[PDB]
Structure formats: structure tokens, C-alpha cells
Write a protein that binds this ligand. Structure first.
Ligand SMILES: O=C(O)[C@]1(O)C[C@@H](O)[C@H](O)[C@H](O)C1
Ligand SMILES: O=C(O)[C@]1(O)C[C@@H](O)[C@H](O)[C@H](O)C1
Lengths: 133, 141
């Protein structure tokens, strides 16, 4: 019965990808504030942590899509993949605005980040209900 | 298969409570950034969404612990709600530090927030394994 656990094992991929992705972003925003108040060695560690969480969640998303090959999950998983990439792109945007110390640049891409994360939340619900079967 | 769907549901409540809880705090951090940049109206929407997401994640943790009753699961469940309480009030500290437009108080409670979340993440993993142990145990009849 690979049906029952490759499925439940797809939930570790999906959930940890999302948890790591939102922590990636949260660390950048925290880091930016840490840089504004002169906490620079601390902020550097939040930037490094955001980079590695982005790499580990991306790897999980790719493995999730590689394993959702039945016709039902197929399109939903690719839409997940494309929206996750959309979100990762915005968070790399947050990192670049932090390295440039630009409040305005941050405001530009933070809108993209919230919009993509709001969609990942609803996609998450559609994926756990589809996979619960 | 009655109890098995309940271990799946319990793992979903937990994973979604944490996701939304971290989203709640990220909204405060980026909303502070927007406010420093002069974007007070966007920041107001982030503040509101942060409260909404805290209310939802807090309802999911309360529901998780209500149905986490077996002894293998109760010890971790009460530590979760105690560690979640710590996170939710560090986030409330972030919101108040934003209220007072003060960088340095934000840094104090941000250390509390990351420290609570580190412990919360370990507690989540233990519950996920324990719930998946019960899951597999039921199928090993
Ligand atoms: O611990 C993390 O991963 C956070 O991502 C650290 C910090 O960026 C935030 O204040 C969040 O509350 C949690
Ligand atoms: O949508 C959210 O919940 C966020 O929490 C909104 C914004 O605060 C962030 O930049 C995150 O990347 C996503």
C-alpha cells in the first residue's frame, strides 16, 4: 500500500515547504528591522537563514510535484509549483531590498509576497482536501 | 478508520496553526517596515490580517489540545499551548513595538518570538511523529 503513505508522506513535503517558506520571509523582514536599529551581526544571520530555508522548501516543492503524477493532482501541483516560485521570487526581492537598505524597494515586493502567500494558503487547503482521498 | 481520520485531522490543525501563526508575525514585521517607509495604510491592513491570523491559529491550537487526550499526546499538547502562548504574546509585543514606532523594543520581543518559534517547531515535529505513530499503529491493527 504505497497509496496510503506516499500520500501521507506528500503532506510532510507540502507542510514543511510552506512552514519553511513563511519563516524565510519572516526572517528577512525581521532582519531589515534589525539593520535599521544597528543590529547588524544579528541581521546577517537572519539573511543566511532565509536563504537556506528558501533552498530547502524549494527542494521539497520540487519533490512534491515529482510525486503528484496522477491526473487529479497534476495541474493542482503545477499551479502550486508556479505560485511557490512566484512567492520565492518576491522573497528574494525582500532580500535584495534589505541589502540595499531601501524602505521603498521593500514596499514594492512585499505586496507580491503577501499576495502569493495568500494564494498558497488557499492552494494548501485545496491540496490537503484532494490528497485526503 | 474513524480514529485514523482524526489523527490526520489533528496533524492538519497543527500544521495550519503554525503556518498562520508565523504569517501573523511576518505581517507585523513587514507592516512595521511599510510604516517606517510612510505606508501607513498598507501597514494598517497588515496589522489587521495579523490579528485575524492569530485568532485563527489560536482556535486551531485550542481545538488540537481538546482532542489530544491520549497520554502519549497530552504531555506534548500542553507544552504546545504553553509555548504557543509565549509566541502569541511576543507577537503582541511586536504589534505594540510597532504602535510605539520603536526599533529597539521590537528587537527585544523579536528575540522572544524567534526563541518561542524554535521551541514550537520542535514540539510540532514530536507531535507529528507521535500522531503518525498512532496512525500507523491503528493500521498495524
Ligand atoms: O523564528 C522564526 O523563524 C521567525 O521567522 C524569526 C523572526 O523572523 C520572526 O519574528 C518570527 O516570529 C519567527
Ligand atoms: O501574506 C502573509 O501572510 C505575509 O505574512 C504578508 C507579508 O507580511 C510577508 O512579506 C509574507 O511573505 C507573507
Amino acid at each position: 500500500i504505497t497509496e496510503l503513505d506516499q500520500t501521507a508522506h506528500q503532506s510532510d513535503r507540502l507542510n514543511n515547504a510552506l512552514l519553511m517558506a513563511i519563516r524565510s520571509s519572516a526572517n528577512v523582514s525581521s532582519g531589515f528591522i534589525e539593520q535599521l536599529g544597528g543590529h547588524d551581526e544579528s541581521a546577517g544571520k537572519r539573511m543566511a537563514l532565509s536563504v537556506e530555508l528558501n533552498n530547502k522548501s524549494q527542494a521539497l516543492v520540487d519533490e512534491f510535484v515529482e510525486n503528484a503524477r496522477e491526473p487529479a493532482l497534476r495541474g493542482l501541483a503545477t499551479e502550486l509549483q508556479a505560485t511557490f516560485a512566484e512567492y520565492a521570487k518576491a522573497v528574494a526581492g525582500q532580500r535584495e531590498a534589505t541589502r540595499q537598505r531601501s524602505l521603498e524597494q521593500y514596499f514594492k515586493v512585499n505586496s507580491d509576497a503577501g499576495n502569493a502567500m495568500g494564494r498558497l494558503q488557499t492552494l494548501r487547503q485545496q491540496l490537503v482536501t484532494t490528497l485526503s482521498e
